[PDB]
Amino acid sequence: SGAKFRISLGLPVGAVINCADNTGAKNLYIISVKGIKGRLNRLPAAGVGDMVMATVKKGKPELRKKVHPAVVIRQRKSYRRKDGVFLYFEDNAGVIVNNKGEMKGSAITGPVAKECADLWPRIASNAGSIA
Amino acid sequence: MKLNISFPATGCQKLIEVDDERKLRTFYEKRMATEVAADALGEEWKGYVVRISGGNDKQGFPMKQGVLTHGRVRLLLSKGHSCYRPRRTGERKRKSVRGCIVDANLSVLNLVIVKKGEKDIPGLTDTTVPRRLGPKRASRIRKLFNLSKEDDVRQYVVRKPLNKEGKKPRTKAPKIQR
């Protein structure tokens, strides 16, 4: 019911956020952001809690050389919360996921941003620490 | 805070609920074993001195003196320590204690009344439960009754009658040791 609010998004298409679930993927090369109409010359960009088509660039060869949906979970670009606190995350990160929002992994290392957890319940359940 | 106040000179102690930050503001940001005046607490406790021996944190974790801060610290403990009973000869264990410093972050405060002022209170200074048993070592018997070595310790000894045994009360007494 409660919608997302925009947040400063510092993962343009080309970024390698590190995979932070137990799949076996190390990296996640972001090849496109989901739900972006866009403009001329503007790279699509995903903040925390965004859906994103990624490719795994290093990790298990089951995962390599194919596209996955994923969710950005942490991000180093500082976003503002409605309560006026800016917040940033030390690393960019994500998790491999399926179209309907379920994790294909099982346990999320490190914290998940609450912008993402509120939006993605199955990620939030596996997430040890939030924000 | 669920203040546990104890008047030691009687042998009676109460659990007093307290709210309103300004009521407790005398206690806050003070160390353990400091003697605070309880006049600001209430006009019932008019001119009362209370030592703050530091009870329990919320989340059940006792204050232990020395650690400072107003948060939890976890320490390696041993035989001869607060907050820890070792279950083996030279057992040693990690347990989380809490700050000496007093804060609203607390379930209980422990207070020991050092001096009562003018007023009295119903379940503390009125009630007078005795020392449960009297002296047992000879020297302490002599010191209680002022005897010296040439005065017979056997006769001037404490003795408790246990009534409602079933048949009749034994005029019972310990074994004087030393």
Binding site: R74, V85, L87, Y88, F89, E90, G110, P111, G128 | -
Partner: protein
């Protein structure tokens, strides 16, 4: 509006200001300003920095 303490300096941080840092170990730090944040990142021990609270506690200043 829970006023928070700066993880480096010790100054209070009012609602509007400052910045929050969520390290991947899974513990978070507030910073009053960028000066403090930089110091924390360069690994400067605030007990060796004269303007921080921690320094003043250590060296028994005031009182």
């Amino acid at each position: 509006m829970k006023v928070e303490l700066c993880s480096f300096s010790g100054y209070k941080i009012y609602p509007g200001h400052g910045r929050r840092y969520a390290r991947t170990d899974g513990k978070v730090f507030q910073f009053l300003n960028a000066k403090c944040e930089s110091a924390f990142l360069s690994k400067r021990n605030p007990r060796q920095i004269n303007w921080t609270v921690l320094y003043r506690r250590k060296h028994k200043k005031g009182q």
